[PDB]
Amino acid sequence: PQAVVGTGWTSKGQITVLDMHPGSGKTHRVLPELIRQCIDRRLRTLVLAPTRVVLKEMERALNGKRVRFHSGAIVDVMCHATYVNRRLLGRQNWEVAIMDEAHWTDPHSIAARGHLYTLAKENKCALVLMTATPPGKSEPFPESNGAITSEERQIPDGEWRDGFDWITEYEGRTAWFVPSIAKGGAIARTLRQKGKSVICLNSKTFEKDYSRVRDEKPDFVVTTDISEMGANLDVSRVIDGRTNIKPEEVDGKVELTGTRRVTTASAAQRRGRVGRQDGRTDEYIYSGQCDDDDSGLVQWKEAQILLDNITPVATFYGPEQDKMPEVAGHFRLTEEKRKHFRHLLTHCDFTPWLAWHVAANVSSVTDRSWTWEGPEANAVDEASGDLVTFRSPNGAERTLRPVWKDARMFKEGRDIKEFVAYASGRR
Numbered sequence: 001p002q003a004v005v006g007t008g009w010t011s012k013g014q015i016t017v018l019d020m021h022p023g024s025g026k027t028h029r030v031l032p033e034l035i036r037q038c039i040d041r042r043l044r045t046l047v048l049a050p051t052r053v054v055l056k057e058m059e060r061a062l063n064g065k066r067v068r069f070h071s072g073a074i075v076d077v078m079c080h081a082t083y084v085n086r087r088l089l090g091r092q093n094w095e096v097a098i099m100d101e102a103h104w105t106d107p108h109s110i111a112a113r114g115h116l117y118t119l120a121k122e123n124k125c126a127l128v129l130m131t132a133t134p135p136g137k138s139e140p141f142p143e144s145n146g147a148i149t150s151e152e153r154q155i156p157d158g159e160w161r162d163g164f165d166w167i168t169e170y171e172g173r174t175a176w177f178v179p180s181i182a183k184g185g186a187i188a189r190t191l192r193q194k195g196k197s198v199i200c201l202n203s204k205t206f207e208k209d210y211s212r213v214r215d216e217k218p219d220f221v222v223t224t225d226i227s228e229m230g231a232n233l234d235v236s237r238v239i240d241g242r243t244n245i246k247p248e249e250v251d252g253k254v255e256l257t258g259t260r261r262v263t264t265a266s267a268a269q270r271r272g273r274v275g276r277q278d279g280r281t282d283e284y285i286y287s288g289q290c291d292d293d294d295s296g297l298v299q300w301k302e303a304q305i306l307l308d309n310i311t312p313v314a315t316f317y318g319p320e321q322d323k324m325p326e327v328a329g330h331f332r333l334t335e336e337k338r339k340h341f342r343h344l345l346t347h348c349d350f351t352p353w354l355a356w357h358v359a360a361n362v363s364s365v366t367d368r369s370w371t372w373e374g375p376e377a378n379a380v381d382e383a384s385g386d387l388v389t390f391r392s393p394n395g396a397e398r399t400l401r402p403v404w405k406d407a408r409m410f411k412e413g414r415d416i417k418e419f420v421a422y423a424s425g426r427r
């Protein structure tokens with residue numbers, strides 16, 4: 001059991017980074033020991049899971065302990081997002097905070113470790129960050145429970161016919177990381193045409209399909225970064241193009257153009273899907289280098305948006321603090337507008353970026369004219385190339401043309417149809 005958590009780790013102001021390689025037992029071994037200690041010492045304790053799947057991991061890992069799981073117990077377990085979103089309103093307090101997967105660059109995750117770091121720094125609580133890749137450390141090839149042979153090869157970027165026999169002549173199960181759902185679909189179509197069984201994991205398919213992997217044992221799992229954390233794919237090979245889709249504010253809009261190179265922490269998680277078992281050798285096949293400079297991504301603005309509205313002078317976790325795009329408190333809203341912000345996040349599935357721009361600028365919680373009164377360049381097109389139309393309750397035909405344009409609302413795991421429900425005032 002890691003050295004720095006024998007005792008004194010639970011002391012107000014203590015920040016414990018556990019740099020623990022993948023498969024090393026952060027979730028199923030170390031966490032139950034930290035909770036057993038916290039409960040014996042009667043310390044009110046917060047546990048933060050990135051995702052529902054890691055939360056369900058924790059429910060098994062903390063089976064037979066007095067713990068309350070959130071969607072007469074002093075340990076609260078919830079998702080990073082749940083914590084931050086609740087703090088946007090009679091807030092609860094804990095004196096120990098344990099964050100699992102504390103590398104995650106989801107804006108709720110950056111915001112939560114920022115708030116907890118700030119509290120720690122003011123002696124309000126003790127903080128434990130657990131991850132294979134602490135923020136600041138640049139290490140794509142961390143340690144494994146078993147050997148991984150890592151090799152650079154050219155990897156197909158879409159459909160292919162000949163020239164990559166090593167993909168289909170492999171005898172074990174593979175996980176192939178792809179930068180988008182669309183790129184995922186084209187890889188999966190080719191693999192199935194080559195007679196392979198394939199399950200696609202992404203935000204649209206996960207809750208139905210993740211549990212199928214264990215059972216069906218497909219030749220391939222074609223997955224986005226959704227599988228970077230707490231996903232057990234039980235594969236012997238990862239194929240990793242080392243790309244991701246990059247949400248970025250460009251000329252006042254959020255775009256999803258093109259690909260960025262992954263961060264070391266992402267490459268490590270992707271490689272981390274294999275080498276989980278000693279006495280087995282697994283493969284990690286990759287293409288090209290990593291890039292730890294993700295400062296231009298909208299996630300940092302979205303993290304500050306969330307952090308400024310859940311708060312001394314609050315900062316990001318120290319290593320990430322260079323990436324706060326504005327002076328602390330810049331994005332704080334009035335109470336009344338934070339209420340609107342929280343509604344749009346929790347009930348309308350808005351990005352933090354869009355929810356902030358709407359709540360800061362719009363007169364009423366009932367106004368929808370912002371969805372059609374944007375500049376002509378912001379008009380949203382259907383697949384067939386026609387501009388999306390819908391009807392306000394008075395029967396007026398509108399073209400979807402939002403003042404604030406976030407491409408994430410109209411592709412890659414969200415549908416135009418759900419935004420139209422909101423724009424037409426059905427919400």
Ligand SMILES: Nc1ncnc2c1ncn2[C@@H]1O[C@H](COP(=O)(O)OP(=O)(O)O)[C@@H](O)[C@H]1O
Pocket residue numbers: 020021022023024025026027028029032
């Ligand atoms: N106390 C325990 N009870 C049950 N399984 C455990 C326990 N400790 C470790 N394991 C198992 O050992 C492995 C630990 O890896 P895991 O906790 O996923 O690592 P990490 O979170 O550091 O990536 C898993 O297969 C887990 O189920």
Ligand SMILES: [Mn+2]
Pocket residue numbers: 026027028230
């Ligand atoms: Mn884990």
Ligand code: NA
Pocket residue numbers: 198199200
């Ligand atoms: Na399928």
